Amino acid sequence: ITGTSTVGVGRGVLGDQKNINTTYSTYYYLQDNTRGNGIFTYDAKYRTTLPGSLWADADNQFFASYDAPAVDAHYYAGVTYDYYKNVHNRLSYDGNNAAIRSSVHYSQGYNNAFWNGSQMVYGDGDGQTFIPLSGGIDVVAHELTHAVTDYTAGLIYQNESGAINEAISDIFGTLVEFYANKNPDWEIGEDVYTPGISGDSLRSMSDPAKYGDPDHYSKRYTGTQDNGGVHINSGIINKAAYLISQGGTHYGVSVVGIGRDKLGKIFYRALTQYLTPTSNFSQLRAAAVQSATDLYGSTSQEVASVKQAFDAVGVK
């Protein structure tokens, strides 16, 4: 809407206070005019019609329990925008500052979040499996990264291309979590998953096998569940990414870590210059090797480490 830019304050899902960019016109709306063509957060009101209504608040204070998922969806969308702009010189998901839209309070007891082709969508969880999912910065960045992927490589959401699609979202979700530098790790969704259980997560990039997922190509899922295992086989690529950044010896293959910034550069370049809608794991290896070559030279440690990592997870 048309209005004047303002700054509200509230608390997120985990009880942390933060400032948020709002817009005033009669009400204070969750509309951040400071980033591209805007970040807009909507209330789905426990229903499934999207986007719902642009979030309106009478006093610019967002401390109600009902407010918390909106505060975090809005704020973390901002952090993710900042990451892509400051780190990769990318302006929003389309590269041209497209408006970023999110809806919260989607459905009832909804244990998921997604990009629906046009916007981000967050459930509140059932209070047992999840608390409201926008409380996870890695989750918010995972979802916005699906938009980035769709506007770039366009990886089809099934089988190997779909598992790459998933891993790209987990990789950048994690890199955004490190960028914000609040309790960062290589786990996915730990801040919002199972409030009754401490120390667990939905997936692990450092050890995918701890949450049921393969860490080597020989252990790839080949059935039809989960669009041919897109959230399962992502473990193979997540492990490779983890090894490229942090190093390690995996099934006897040692990888020299080159750090998160170079991981990010290599995979961003692969995503935006080399991957296609039908790329498979082998093609991802080639894309990453070429990206590392472009950036650091064919005889570089960076190129050697990318090769080592894909070797370690059995992807040739």
59 lies in the binding site for Ca ion (CB under 5 A):
yes
Q: Minimal distance in Å, beta carbon 25 to ligand 0PJ?
A: 32
Stretch touching ligand 0PJ by CB under 6 A, among 110-118, 208-216, 284-292, 308-316? 110-118
What are phi and psi for residue 233, nearest 5 degrees?
-65, -15
22 has which bridge partners? 6
Nearer to ligand 0PJ, 117 or 252 (CB): 117
Closest-CB residue for Zn ion?
169
Catalytic residue IDs: 143, 231
Say if residues 275 and 221 touch (Cβ distance below 8 Å): no
54 has which bridge partners? 42
Q: Which tokens is 94 given?
A: 């389309």
107 lies in the binding site for ligand 0PJ (CB under 6 A):
no
| CB-CB neighbours of 316 under 10 Å | 10
Q: Minimal distance in Å, beta carbon 232 to ligand 0PJ?
A: 9
Say if residues 218 and 314 touch (Cβ distance below 8 Å): yes
Closest-CB residue for ligand 0PJ?
114
194 lies in the binding site for Ca ion (CB under 5 A):
yes
Q: Which tokens is 64 given?
A: 């109600």
| CB-CB neighbours of 127 under 10 Å | 12
Rounded CA separation 245/267 (Å): 11
Return the one option of Zn ion, ligand 0PJ, Ca ion, none that residue 82 interacts with (CB less than 5 to 8 A, by type).
Answer: none
Return the one option of Zn ion, ligand 0PJ, Ca ion, none that residue 61 interacts with (CB less than 5 to 8 A, by type).
Answer: Ca ion
Which residues contact ligand 0PJ (rule: CB under 6 A)? 111-117, 133, 139, 142-143, 146, 157, 188-189, 202, 226, 231
